[PDB]
Amino acid sequence: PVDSIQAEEWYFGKIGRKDAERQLLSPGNPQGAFLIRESETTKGAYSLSIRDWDQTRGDHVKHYKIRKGYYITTRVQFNSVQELVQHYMEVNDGLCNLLIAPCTIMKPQTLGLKDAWEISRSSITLERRLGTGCFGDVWLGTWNGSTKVAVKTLKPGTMSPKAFLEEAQVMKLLRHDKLVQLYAVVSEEPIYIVTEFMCHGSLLDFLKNPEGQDLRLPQLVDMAAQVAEGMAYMERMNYIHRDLRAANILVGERLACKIADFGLARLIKDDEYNPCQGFPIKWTAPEAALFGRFTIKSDVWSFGILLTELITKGRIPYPGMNKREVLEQVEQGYHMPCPPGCPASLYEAMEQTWRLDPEERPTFEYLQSFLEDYFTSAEPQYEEIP
Numbered sequence: 001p002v003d004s005i006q007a008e009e010w011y012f013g014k015i016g017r018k019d020a021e022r023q024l025l026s027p028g029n030p031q032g033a034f035l036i037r038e039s040e041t042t043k044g045a046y047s048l049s050i051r052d053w054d055q056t057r058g059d060h061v062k063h064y065k066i067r068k069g070y071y072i073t074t075r076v077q078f079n080s081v082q083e084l085v086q087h088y089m090e091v092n093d094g095l096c097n098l099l100i101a102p103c104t105i106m107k108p109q110t111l112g113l114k115d116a117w118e119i120s121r122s123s124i125t126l127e128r129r130l131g132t133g134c135f136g137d138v139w140l141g142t143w144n145g146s147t148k149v150a151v152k153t154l155k156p157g158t159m160s161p162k163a164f165l166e167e168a169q170v171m172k173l174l175r176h177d178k179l180v181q182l183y184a185v186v187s188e189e190p191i192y193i194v195t196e197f198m199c200h201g202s203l204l205d206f207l208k209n210p211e212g213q214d215l216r217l218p219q220l221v222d223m224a225a226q227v228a229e230g231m232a233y234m235e236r237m238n239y240i241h242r243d244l245r246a247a248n249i250l251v252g253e254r255l256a257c258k259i260a261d262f263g264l265a266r267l268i269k270d271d272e273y274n275p276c277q278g279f280p281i282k283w284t285a286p287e288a289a290l291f292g293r294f295t296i297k298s299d300v301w302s303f304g305i306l307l308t309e310l311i312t313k314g315r316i317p318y319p320g321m322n323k324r325e326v327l328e329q330v331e332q333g334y335h336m337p338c339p340p341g342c343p344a345s346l347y348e349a350m351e352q353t354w355r356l357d358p359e360e361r362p363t364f365e366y367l368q369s370f371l372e373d374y375f376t377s378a379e380p381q382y383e384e385i386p
């Protein structure tokens, strides 16, 4: 609609508490940036998250509870949430700060010419080569000197411009805060694919670094919920990853995980990505490795293997078994035991993602909701009187 609350700039739907903090503390957001999100109690309850500043906490986010007219304090109540937001945007009446502007993830401005992603190569400056490959490099660079970006380049003569840019075409359609955001392209040789920059790089490297080794259990589960949130989006868009693994997850600031993929030249058919044509054995579901049945349910098997990498901080799956032993044992019903330090409840979700019947595996919508509400315990049974 046009008057509904969902159409407002500051309404962010049903995003996690940690996700609201990460987007509010992202660059470009002033002190007093806010958003309205749905809480965990019910669907009719809301929460207000504001970007504040203390000299002890630094730049942090304060969260207020909106319940039911709608109100934050019992003194002042309103008809709708939009009137509550309008009031606290005009009068700092008890809040930690006056509501200034809605939360915006500041993506840079392109040329605006109709390929809205085309930019002049003068605006991109390559700084450091992050990786090399048969078809091109991955660079760390800057766009207009300020914002840091990552650029995928195309080595001439190794790949057609259309087959290389097909990755950019797919990334235009897949737009989500838990997927790598495409920023811009340069369609003349040498071809550029400019995206957001995830400063910590691969999740597998991040887990094996000194910072990742000191990660607690609630932090690992939050990163797992983000990966499931990203795949739940691909589930809604009828896309599949085919290569879901910890090495294909990029980690940014405040443990912000995003879905990524590398080496897409094996999946090119007719300037399109066909997943069923010829993979990592220990991550692909057994029905995909033997019969080529690549579906979103095979990515759920991959996500279960990814959970073992997270809960063990980067351990190889199926230790001591070669690539041939795993495929024979998996078809005999074998899967990995409960990893060291993994709770029983989480290992139950892993076993569900490893059921040999792909249609009996959980959906990513359930996995996201499970991992997001993994530490929020159940409310006690109380009899509601009419």
Ligand SMILES: CCN1CCN(Cc2ccc(NC(=O)c3ccc(C)c(Oc4ncnc5cc(OC)c(OC)cc45)c3)cc2C(F)(F)F)CC1
Pocket (backbone or CB within 6 Å): 130, 131, 138, 139, 150, 151, 152, 167, 170, 171, 174, 179, 180, 193, 194, 195, 196, 197, 198, 199, 200, 201, 202, 239, 240, 241, 242, 243, 250, 259, 260, 261, 262, 267, 273, 274, 275
């Ligand atoms: C059926 C097949 N299906 C089809 C759909 N397909 C979805 C798909 C397709 C293509 C991409 N594109 C990328 O992933 C990507 C794009 C550009 C760059 C520069 C990039 O690399 C880095 N980007 C950002 N920061 C980096 C930081 C680094 O270190 C500091 C680093 O080190 C080298 C690399 C960094 C990664 C993402 C997805 C997604 F799954 F996400 F939706 C999945 C498979």
